[PDB]
Amino acid sequence: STAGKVIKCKAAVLWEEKKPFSIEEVEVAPPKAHEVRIKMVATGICRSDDHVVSGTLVTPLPVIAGHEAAGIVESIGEGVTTVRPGDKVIPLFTPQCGKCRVCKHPEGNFCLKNDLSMPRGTMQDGTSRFTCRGKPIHHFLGTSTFSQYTVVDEISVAKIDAASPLEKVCLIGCGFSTGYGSAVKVAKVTQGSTCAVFGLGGVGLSVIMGCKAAGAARIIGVDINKDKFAKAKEVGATECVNPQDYKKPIQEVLTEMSNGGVDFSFEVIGRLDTMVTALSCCQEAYGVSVIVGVPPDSQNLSMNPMLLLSGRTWKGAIFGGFKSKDSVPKLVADFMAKKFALDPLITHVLPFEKINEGFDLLRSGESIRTILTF
């Protein structure tokens, strides 16, 4: 009838680097103790899944990527208590073991039981829940959501509102929370403040919303593509500056506009130079700059430490600084409240079989966000 045993579905497998995804037939073993098996309803395509493909983000291959999705619980293993079959959920790429040095810390969120630091591409027990033909296939993070079914550990799953449109809230899985959290939890934006966001992409758009929910009073969005300027404005940016029309460094034109410099700056592109530029357009005495992302293959940036000496702060974070298991559920509750919208972000919805087409839209172009539906 149901499941309590091996399943057979299609999943997008990466056998080799820089090769497309091969839609294959795989077997998904039943959940062991404290594991949960989920049937995917939708998964978004994020830059990091693409790194894996390039070999930039180094994790054991073949693998089953994806980490930004929402689904419905099919079956739960022994000792599980946070979810029940039928429950809407969101796989968590940043766990919440809830008892490490970091989980217990009032601010920390990068659970020690994560798998990006030193990826293993397995489950918490060190075995894989996947095989294609006779070959085991590795997990991605603790999610591997580019499969019709996946198994995740209980500290890597969040139970959400049962009324949740899983085709839209899947965003809270990475893209949206990463940006939004950077503003409201990491930089801890104050109201009346002036903010600058470098990069008007999806995560970028997310920050501008956090800055807005946060109460900010002025949000300058900066990008060298005039095209991205409308949604940003529509979603929250009060200004949009294209550094390509100025005849001077924009850190300069930025400090001039902010009359001393912005209160908080966000670098959501991942560029080294822009990393330093965003640092300097921040008010020298009490400005806070946040790095939302740095490519897995990033090199060292040159910086003058006198930049920090005045009184400036430089932070980083993963997953918008949010305690994953505790917060994901609340972001949904707020989305449900009518609080924020997620629609201006979804620019494309494709059937899951057309994954490689999703990556093309992504890889080169403008597709703010492509959602793969199962």
Segment near Zn ion (CB under 5 A); pick from 47-55, 83-91, 257-265, 280-288 = 47-55
Please state, in angstroms and rounded to a whole number, the distance separating the CA atoms of residues 213 and 191.
9
- Answer for the pair 176, 319: CB distance below 8 angstroms, yes or no: no
Our finding on whether 305 is near its own copies (CB under 8 A) is yes
Query: Binding to ligand APR by residue 183, rule CB under 6 A?
Result: no
- What is the distance between the alpha carbons of residues 367 and 370, in angstroms, rounded to a whole number? 7
170 is in an annotated binding site: no
For the bound state, the minimum distance from the C-beta of residue 308 to its own copies, rounded and expressed in Å, comes to 3
- Enumerate residues 307-326 that contact its own copies by CB under 8 A: 307-318, 321
- As a whole number of angstroms, the distance between CA 140 and CA 124 comes to 12
Please give the single-letter amino acid code of residue 178: T
Site for its own copies in 275-294 (CB under 8 A): 275, 283-286, 291, 293-294
**Residue 240 designated active-site:** no
Q: Which does 311 bind (CB under 5 to 8 A by kind): ligand APR, Zn ion, its own copies, none?
A: its own copies
Catalytic residue check, 51: yes
How far is Cα 317 from Cα 109, in angstroms, rounded to an integer? 9
**369 appears as a binding residue in the annotation:** yes
Catalytic residue list contains 144: no
Q: Does 174 bind Zn ion (CB under 5 A)?
A: yes
49 binds ligand APR (CB under 6 A): no
> Cβ closer to ligand APR: 47 or 129?
47
Which C-beta is closer to its own copies: that of 123 or that of 282?
282
Examine the residue annotation and report whether 9 is marked as an active-site residue of this protein: no
User: Would you say 251 or 367 has its CB closer to Zn ion?
Assistant: 367
- Alpha-carbon distance of 129 to 122, in angstroms, equals 8
127/225 with CB nearer ligand APR = 225
Please measure the distance between the N-terminal and C-terminal CA atoms of the chain and give it in whole angstroms: 21
Question: 278, 265 in Cβ contact below 8 A?
Answer: yes
Q: Which is nearer to Zn ion, 9 or 116 (CB)?
A: 116
Q: Is 55 annotated as a binding residue?
A: no
Among 34, 138, 139, 174, the active-site one is 174
Stretch 185-244 residues interacting with ligand APR (CB under 6 A): 198-204, 223-225, 228, 243
- Residue 312 counted as an annotated binding residue: no
Exposed/middle/buried for residue 2 (C-beta within 10 Å: 0-12, 13-18, 19+): exposed
Give me the phi and psi of 270, to 5 degrees please.
115, 10
Catalytic annotation, pick one of 1, 9, 22, 48:
48
Whole-Å CA distances, 261 to 207, 215, 276, 282: 18, 18, 14, 5
Residue 279 corresponds to which tokens in the numbers above? 């640092």
Distance CA 353, CA 254 (A): 45
Q: Which residues pair with 8 in a beta bridge?
A: 27
Distances in Å between the Cα of 161 and the Cα atoms of 88, 92, 166 are 7, 16, 10
Q: Is 302 exposed, middle or buried (0-12, 13-18, 19+ CB in 10 A)?
A: exposed
Under the binding rule (CB under 6 A), the answer on residue 47 touching ligand APR is yes
Residues 255-314 that bind ligand APR (CB under 6 A): 268-271, 274, 292-293, 295
Q: Which does 228 bind (CB under 5 to 8 A by kind): Zn ion, its own copies, ligand APR, none?
A: ligand APR
Q: Are strands 313-316 and 288-291 parallel, antiparallel or unpaired?
A: parallel
What is the spatial distance between Cα 280 and Cα 294, in angstroms, rounded to a whole number?
Answer: 18
Which residues sit at the interface with its own copies, rule CB under 8 A?
A: 101-102, 105, 107-110, 112, 259-260, 272, 275, 283-286, 291, 293-294, 298-318, 321
Which residues sit at the interface with Zn ion, rule CB under 5 A?
A: 46, 48, 97, 100, 103, 111, 174
Q: Which residues are catalytic?
A: 46, 48, 51, 67, 174
Which residues sit at the interface with ligand APR, rule CB under 6 A?
A: 47, 198-204, 223-225, 228, 243, 268-271, 274, 292-293, 295
